[PDB]
Design a protein around this nucleic acid. Structure first.
Length: 54
RNA sequence: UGAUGGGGUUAGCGCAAGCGAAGCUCUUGAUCGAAGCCCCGGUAAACGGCGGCCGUAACUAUAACGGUCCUAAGGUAGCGA
């Protein structure tokens, strides 16, 4: 299914269009989420290199 | 239906004037008085009626959302140049 907003956008582009996605602000090519370095829980039980116990 | 209230006439009383019973009259309307109407509900396959404005979401668009005024209620499903 296509959304009701996108159906209204399609009707207004057929009927004398403007193509408002051009007037949308262009996102960068990367991702803009929040990057957090890990916590002590995550680093303490990350289990890297899996070296056996002696 | 006619309680009263008022007037006309006059037997009589007052020498003018004026007062005036009864009767007969003209009028006034107390009371009595049902449906209806006002009132109280019901009824829309009874006649009929079924709203505005503004803001708002991933940089656009749109508004699920919210605000407010009014209403008897704000047009549902389905359909739609």
């Amino acid at each position: 299914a296509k959304s009701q907003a996108k159906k209204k956008r399609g009707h207004r582009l057929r009927n004398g269009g403007r193509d408002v996605l051009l007037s949308r602000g262009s996102t960068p090519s990367f991702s803009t989420h929040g990057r957090m370095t890990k916590s002590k829980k995550e680093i303490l039980n990350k289990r890297k290199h899996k070296n056996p116990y002696d």
